[PDB]
Copies of this chain bind each other. A is one copy, B any other.
Amino acid sequence: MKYMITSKGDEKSDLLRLNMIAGFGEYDMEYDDVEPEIVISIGGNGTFLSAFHQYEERLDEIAFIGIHTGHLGFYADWRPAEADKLVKLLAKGEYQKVSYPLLKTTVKYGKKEATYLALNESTVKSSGGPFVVDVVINDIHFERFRGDGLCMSTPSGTTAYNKSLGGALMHPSIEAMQLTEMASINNRVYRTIGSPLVFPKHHVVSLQPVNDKDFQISVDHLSILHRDVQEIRYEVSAKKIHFARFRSFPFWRRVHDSFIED
């Protein structure tokens, strides 16, 4: 099967990558970083995010696998010491496929609209400057949000920025996105919902400028200053990320291991 390996680029990750390629050489099992069927990431959570975004135009043809050199593997299954076992398992085709939901972000201007795919989240802040937007859900005006910004998370994204903002952790079998507030202003004149909101597939959340059409918009690691924005639109993507697995490693066990104990 066609595969490639991305490395964090430090000595540790590079050498692990070379050894895996050498091991894959004894199998069938072609290195191809143009049209891989398997993408292996070796590094931190950032390395995995880079791997995902490198191949976001062929997500339907790829199964992702992570080895984490950091603490701390939300998209890793594997430790550096387990690399030889993974080589043998991958070569044998000894795996099942699991899929997580993704978030579509559309930015409209005074055209051409830009579309982004997020594995963790997309956030919006001001470029300045007071942040004020109208929040429109399925064409109904829901609230005028004033504060620091807003975060829209995928289910797998809920353990990250979403969690820090008081959002719920959601099992990735649920096809949803979650909107959290950053430092909302609430007084007798200005009001927000002041709770995270969880949206199903096909629900559309639109942010519309009130002032003030410049925004700092993030998509996972990427952060861009967008000018002359008319709308930011959030919806669950029709696209999914696929993982190759190998052994049972339940989401809630992954949550336990990351936040409670070892």
Contact = CB atoms under 8 A, between A and B. Distances in A.
A59 interface: no
A218 to B, nearest CB: 12
A203 B143 contact: no
Interface string A234-262: 00000000000000001011011111111
Integer count of this chain's copies in the complex: 4
Interface string A41-83: 0000000000000000000000000000001100000000000
A257 B193 CA distance: 11
A1 interface: no
Contact of A259 (B72, B173, B187, B196): B187
Contact of A260 (B166, B193, B256, B258): B193
Given A166-B166, A168-B196, A176-B174, A140 B189 contact: no
Interface residues of A, number: 54
Contacts of A229: none
A226 B187 CA distance: 32
Interface string A139-155: 01111000110000000
